[PDB]
Every structure is written in C-alpha cells, then in structure tokens.
C-alpha cells in the first residue's frame with residue numbers, strides 16, 4: 383500500500399519486538415528502501431540526531447500512515463550475523479580486527495551524541511550497499527537512549543533493579559545485575575561479539591533452559607563463572623585486554639576509544655597482515 387504519499391510498501395523481510403521491516407520503494411525516484419511498521423518515535427530522536435554520521439543510516443520519512451507508525455530508511459546490505467553464517471561462522475582474525483575498528487567507531491559516534499545503543503549484536507550491524515559495501519552500519523530499532531543531557535551533559539543517574547534490556551547472550555555483566563546501562567556497557571557487549579566471531583559461539587550460548595526466565599538465569603550464571611582468560615584462551619591477548627578494560631569502567635566513565643582501537647591495530651601490525659581492505663566474505 384502506498385505510504386507517505388510516495389512510498390510503495392512491499393514484501394516483509396523481518397519481524398521483531400520492534401515491529402516489522404518491509405522492503406519498499408519510492409514511486410517518484412524509484413529507490414529501494416526499508417520500511418518499519420509499528421502499532422499505533424523514540425527511535426526517531428536517535429536517528430535525526432545521529433544524522434550525517436559515518437555508518438548511520440538515513441531516515442527518509444517519519445510518521446503515522448493510518449493505524450501504524452512508519453519509518454523509512456535507506457536500504458542496506460546483509461547483517462554481520464548473516465555474513466558470519468555465509469562464512470561457516472568462522473571469521474579470520476583479520477576480518478575480526480577490521481570489523482573491530484569500525485564497530486568501536488560507530489559506538490563512539492553514538493556516544494559523542496549523548497546516546498547508548500543498548501543492543502549491540504551481530505544482527506544490528508549491516509554492511510553498506512554498492513560502493514558503501516565495506517562500511518559497517520549500526521541500526522537502532524528502539525533501545526537507543528540518552529545517557530546524558532544534550533545541553534548540560536549531566537550523565538543519567540545510576541539505577542538498580544532494572545529488567546534485562548537488549549539481548550541476553552551479549553549483555554554486559556552489570557546489565558544482567560539490573561544496573562542502568564551506560565557507555566561502558568555498549569563496549570563490553572561489543573567485546574562478546576568479537577569473541578563470538580573468533581569462537582563461533584559463546585560458552586553461555588544454547589544453554590539447556592526449561593523456561594525463558596531459567597534461560598536468562600543460566601546464561602547470567604555461566605557468564606559470571608566464565609573468567610575472561612578462559613573465554614579468550616587461545617586468542618590474542620588483546621581480546622582479554624579489551625574485555626578487562628570495559629569491565630573496569632565506572633558507571634559514568636568516558637571510554638578511551640582510541641586506546642581500544644589501537645589495541646587492535648597494534649595487533650594487526652604484529653600479525654603482519656596485508657593492509658588490503660578485504661573481508662572474509664569477499665574472498666575465495
């Protein structure tokens with residue numbers, strides 16, 4: 383159905399607690415686009431304030447189309463989780479390091495603009511299209527939220543007893559504890575995703591859990607009993623240094639992004655990798 387006067391709806395590509403994603407187009411220009419339908423805005427504030435950033439998708443139209451809330455953004459490519467499968471869920475160290483630099487930068491971008499993602503995972507990272515093909519994009523469906531006042535820059539208050547927000551498998555340890563999330567948390571999650579790409583699955587993954595709750599319970603338990611040095615055994619120390627650093631951050635602490643990025647470029651240099659920017663999936 384014709385929506386936003388100029389966008390034709392189309393096949394639905396994905397469902398989610400967030401709503402549904404449909405492929406669609408622009409009757410006028412004819413540009414493939416993605417559209418999200420939500421049962422009759424917090425995501426809108428994040429996008430229009432991340433606008434212009436590298437790896438931040440463009441929103442082309444916001445509003446209600448009858449009983450639903452619409453959001454149209456530029457079409458992007460596969461997610462890192464899709465590519466992970468395309469590559470037998472085994473990423474070379476180089477691709478992991480290549481991705482690590484970009485992903486740390488997106489997160490820092492969101493942070494420099496008073497927001498925390500809160501659901502950092504393979505699935506929320508999509509590759510660009512065309513010549514933006516090697517650019518990693520970050521997508522927010524609705525968990526992004528301010529962590530400081532745009533004006534004053536006062537960091538939001540500390541809080542406990544909060545229910546699990548974002549995916550359990552990649553959640554920071556304090557999130558599991560019910561602690562208000564902050565920048566440190568977006569980073570820690572990224573820590574687990576990076577280890578997830580090296581191992582192929584985290585040790586708290588696929589836990590025999592009778593019910594939902596017991597599920598988040600077992601994962602939380604397994605995550606807190608798995609020491610970093612055990613989780614990263616057999617891999618470059620940088621991954622241990624990364625996770626340990628994030629887990630050290632105070633609640634309102636400002637992360638040292640460059641230190642983290644450099645942690646991985648020092649490792650890139652020492653492996654002797656070629657600086658040819660090619661990810662595993664564009665190789666034979």
Ligand SMILES: Nc1ncnc2c1c(COc1cccc(Cl)c1)nn2C1CCOCC1
Nearest residue numbers: 395396403416418453455456457458522523
């Ligand atoms: N832009 C996109 N281009 C190609 N594919 C896409 C997307 C989005 C985000 O689309 C929107 C549109 C408006 C608002 C919001 Cl949040 C998200 N998701 N997906 C896939 C859906 C199925 O599962 C994996 C990702």
